[PDB]
């Protein structure tokens, strides 16, 4: 019925980001994170999931490539987790 | 005839990046940089131009938004400028 969805979480991330929260598409590459947050401390990758939903294996594989190149990826699935992710970025 | 083009410069950037060099598209937003370089020191924006060509005003306006949010944007238009940009990122 009225449980929050992935799109709700994504809209909340956009609202709370102090900086830019740009949609990220990368033609030809599978599984890239939904958003790139641009703020004073860095540009950060964020994948948004519906409450309780894990990234698919193709998404995890892409996150691993990002981590191997040396950067982190946040996965958010609730307003609380959005708040925590943004706070961590603000303290990076 | 055989002068390097924007695509040549972009291919060279991809070849020389120590990390990921992901195509960046952001549906609904005009003028975003061509590529996001992911390496140990950060995730960085790069716009690629043909030799001697300046970013269009809509691209400059987007770069300004990125800079106001607190991050830099590199503009590369030659193999030399690619080398210099990547070296600066490796030293970030
Ligand atoms: Mg998602
Ligand atoms: Mg270009």
Residue numbers in the entry:
A (entry chain A), B (entry chain A): -1 to 90
What does the published report state?
However, we were able to solve the first VRR-Nuc domain structures using single-domain proteins derived from three bacteria and bacteriophage as surrogates: Psychrobacter (psNUC); Streptococcus equi bacteriophage P9 (stNUC); and Salmonella enteritidis typing phage 3 (saNUC). Crystal structures of three representatives show that they structurally resemble Holliday junction resolvases (HJRs), are dimeric in solution, and are able to cleave symmetric four-way junctions. DALI searches show that the structures with greatest similarity to the VRR-Nuc domains are all Holliday-junction-resolving enzymes exemplified by Hjc. As dimers, bacterial VRR-Nuc domains have two active sites and a DNA-binding surface with 2-fold symmetry that are well suited to the recognition and symmetrical, bilateral cleavage of Holliday junctions.
